[PDB]
Amino acid sequence: ADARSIYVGNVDYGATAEELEAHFHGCGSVNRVTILCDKFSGHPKGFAYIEFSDKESVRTSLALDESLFRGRQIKVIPKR
Amino acid sequence: ADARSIYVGNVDYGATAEELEAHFHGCGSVNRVTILCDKFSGHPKGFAYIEFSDKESVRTSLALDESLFRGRQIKVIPKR
């Protein structure tokens, strides 16, 4: 479950689960999206977890590290 | 933290953390918003945990149970 998950660093408070999924839909089936935010205005402060169905999708998703999501470049590293 | 959080059922999958915090701003100062969503087809719902700065804010927030948020009546209870 941790093995099938990525950390997604640098995620604002306007990130919706709908959108984050859609940004990784291309890498494989997604089971869950978890967004965590510690600021809700001003400069943002938050990450998310994407838990894919299959493990393969984790190696695949690393191809989006440094990609532009919602106008900001995200950090994609596996949860394990 | 769990003594300071509420569980929020029926959260539309288009919800943002800023929108949630705005909805709950009246009840007290919020540390952390966590949005969890498991389905990404149609107009599904997920849920959220709202962590406050203060234990008293939880009881206050319980008033917003059944209140309307993005076209759904939300369920507000203290975190199990």
Side-chain angles (χ1 to χ4, degrees):
Chain A
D2 262 34
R4 303 172 293 106
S5 280
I6 38 168
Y7 168 89
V8 173
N10 197 45
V11 162
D12 58 299
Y13 39 64
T16 69
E18 178 174 20
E19 283 183 72
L20 254 178
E21 193 280 344
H23 190 74
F24 292 82
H25 198 76
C27 327
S29 219
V30 182
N31 286 335
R32 170 171 278 196
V33 175
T34 318
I35 291 163
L36 308 92
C37 296
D38 299 312
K39 288 278 297 300
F40 317 97
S41 60
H43 288 295
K45 188 188 167 157
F47 48 105
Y49 291 124
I50 318 285
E51 179 203 317
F52 297 106
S53 298
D54 234 81
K55 293 181 181 179
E56 359 125 313
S57 316
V58 182
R59 292 179 181 176
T60 314
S61 66
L62 299 192
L64 283 189
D65 179 5
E66 284 152 40
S67 66
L68 292 206
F69 173 68
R70 283 180 61 66
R72 17 216 305 152
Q73 88 140 242
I74 56 167
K75 193 86 211 285
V76 185
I77 49 169
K79 202 182 172 168
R80 166 176 316 160
Chain B
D2 298 13
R4 278 184 278 101
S5 292
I6 62 195
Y7 158 91
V8 178
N10 254 287
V11 190
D12 192 67
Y13 103 129
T16 83
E18 183 276 319
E19 278 172 33
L20 275 165
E21 178 292 337
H23 193 74
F24 275 90
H25 196 97
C27 318
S29 149
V30 177
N31 283 161
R32 171 170 271 181
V33 171
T34 318
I35 297 155
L36 310 101
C37 179
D38 288 347
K39 293 181 181 179
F40 309 88
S41 64
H43 290 280
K45 56 182 207 165
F47 59 107
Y49 291 118
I50 290 157
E51 182 193 340
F52 295 111
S53 284
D54 318 302
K55 293 181 181 179
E56 292 178 358
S57 292
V58 163
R59 326 184 92 217
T60 338
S61 60
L62 296 181
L64 295 157
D65 187 48
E66 279 162 21
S67 65
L68 197 278
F69 179 79
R70 324 196 77 239
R72 310 201 209 221
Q73 297 197 55
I74 44 165
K75 170 170 179 179
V76 172
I77 56 167
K79 194 168 163 199
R80 287 153 212 160

